[PDB]
Ligand binder design. Structure first.
Ligand SMILES: COc1cccc2[nH]c(C(=O)N[C@@H](CC(C)C)C(=O)N[C@@H](C[C@@H]3CCNC3=O)C(=O)c3nc4ccccc4s3)cc12
Ligand SMILES: COc1cccc2[nH]c(C(=O)N[C@@H](CC(C)C)C(=O)N[C@@H](C[C@@H]3CCNC3=O)C(=O)c3nc4ccccc4s3)cc12
Lengths: 298, 291
């Protein structure tokens, strides 16, 4: 199994740069609107004490330099939606793909297109941690890079990049500007909640092992969801939701292993350890492959 | 620090579907030529002379391109079409060296499916992710809007690793394009890349494996060969200079850390979240991402 990103071309065609004053970040150009982090308007003396909504009153359309490459897009309007700025431009992007804005749940994966000054630099897959951080690879100037999924040529944008935490993980918003997790867009050292293991993805990993014939961990036990969830928390595993049970349905049907039977198999692995054995060639359980990712590769 | 592929858009615009008889795979459309694995004509030289232009159905999305000529170059078929691809990037064909990395755009039925980074192994396989119908997917690097194509996909070995050709149709490794079970040579670990990745781990604040000891180059190499690692050359030492300059760790100091890692193991600890020594990041891969 590889971490595979989605092909990035439909998003590459949407990346622009937005400069206000001396600060440049990335923006997302869809139809005649450019989306970018609102703190592009911030000076060095703000950022610590964000006056963003009031800072915006002093700004006008002619203060924003939006560029596709070095071609300027004239801004004809602007507004703030939570932590994102929306700049109306006078040109509809001809490369606009079919798209949606979606808010993802912890455990879900998405492709990040890392960009600097409007120019795409690389692509890689990320997983939203239960503490609403991602293990990105972002440098100075990355803000406004986006994360996305592609289903039947429709691009679901789910992430825009804002911040690196002191611990080196990353935090951001959806495309309506609402942060994932308890972070704010201030120049300020913030702490995430203690992370946990993504149980639904570990289960998907065990299904992937079964599909490939590695199934020694299957047992003759089952569990209720409540009993499992209470044991899971004692090992710093996430509790399962009904939605988690539901997205494991296709893999359960494919292997003939009930979800609750697979939970009981994981419960044993958690209480008794791996006994030095391996699963898919590893003593470590992987929790960054979703059920959809597993069927994608199998 | 993450395994990072190049943005695939310039390549996606070149992928097409090629069908001949009951066989369908992917092709690469550059200017007015489509490049694809020659065995698209199989259900090859006597078999190709018996084919006509119209036996080939080439599709770019919905539109069909008209084949007006064809030639074979080694294991690649070159189909001349009557339409030029307007999205053709500036490009080059290159044959990569073992240990170098590239991005793969896995495609099915002419449609791009996923992108990920691979290394050309010392035994000239690659550890990819390819299914039925992935043949003709390509590997590439991007340098200032210029796409260097280096790989076209042909085969999956019984061990699950993969084999293919350069864009001249010459295989990497001792493989042939036949429906047979083929074994590769014994693989080794790319030493210069493991060292690059250990430097990456230092740049990202991971230091538990550093030590005070040092080693000579020959003594390191004696241990390296013992653990089935490739020799480290003075040119590799030179190539690691910048990363040594940034971190202030001499290359042979890092070699001493790798030697102890090899003789002692990691003791359950991890490096950049990995429990295994990683050898698919080149020194350039570390540099271009960390700066
Ligand atoms: C004492 O303050 C700290 C203490 C401990 C850890 C800390 N982290 C951050 C923090 O992340 N700040 C945000 C910015 C805030 C406003 C959301 C920020 O720099 N975002 C970057 C992406 C960063 C950069 C490095 N790789 C990461 O991904 C980004 O692109 C932006 N650059 C600018 C530059 C000027 C104006 C707007 C923006 S937005 C501050 C901080
Ligand atoms: C006794 O035979 C074996 C025994 C033990 C291991 C084996 N491996 C292979 C083997 O790899 N064959 C080649 C094809 C040969 C001709 C190069 C092949 O199937 N390539 C695939 C990609 C494959 C498929 C699975 N994932 C991989 O990446 C591709 O797309 C192509 N498909 C066809 C189908 C029909 C005609 C042309 C092509 S070209 C055969 C084999």
């Amino acid at each position: 199994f590889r971490k595979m990103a989605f092909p990035s071309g439909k998003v590459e065609g949407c990346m622009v740069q937005v400069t206000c004053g001396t600060t440049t970040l990335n923006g997302l150009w869809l139809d005649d609107v450019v989306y970018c982090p609102r703190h592009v308007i911030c000076t060095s003396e703000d950022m610590l004490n964000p006056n963003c909504e009031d800072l915006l009153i002093r700004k006008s359309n002619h203060n924003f330099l939006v560029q596709a490459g070095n071609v300027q897009l004239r801004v004809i309007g602007h507004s703030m939606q939570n932590c994102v700025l929306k700049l109306k431009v006078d040109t509809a992007n001809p490369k606009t793909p079919k798209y949606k804005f979606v808010r993802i749940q912890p455990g879900q994966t998405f492709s990040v297109l890392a960009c600097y000054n409007g120019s795409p630099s690389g692509v890689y897959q990320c997983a939203m941690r239960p503490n609403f951080t991602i293990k990105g690879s972002f440098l100075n100037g990355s803000c406004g890079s986006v994360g996305f999924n592609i289903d039947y040529d429709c691009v679901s944008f789910c992430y825009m990049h804002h911040m690196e935490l002191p611990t080196g993980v990353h935090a951001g918003t959806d495309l309506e500007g609402n942060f994932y997790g308890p972070f704010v867009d201030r120049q300020t050292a913030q702490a995430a909640g203690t992370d946990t293991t993504i149980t639904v993805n570990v289960l998907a990993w065990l299904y992937a092992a079964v599909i490939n014939g590695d199934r020694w961990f299957l047992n003759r036990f089952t569990t209720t969801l409540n009993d499992f969830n209470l044991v899971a928390m004692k090992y710093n595993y996430e509790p399962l939701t009904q939605d988690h049970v539901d997205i494991l349905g296709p893999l359960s049907a494919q292997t003939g292993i009930a979800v609750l039977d697979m939970c009981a198999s994981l419960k044993e692995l958690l209480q008794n350890g791996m006994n030095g054995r391996t699963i898919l060639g590893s003593a470590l359980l992987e929790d960054e492959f979703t059920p959809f990712d597993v069927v994608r590769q199998c």
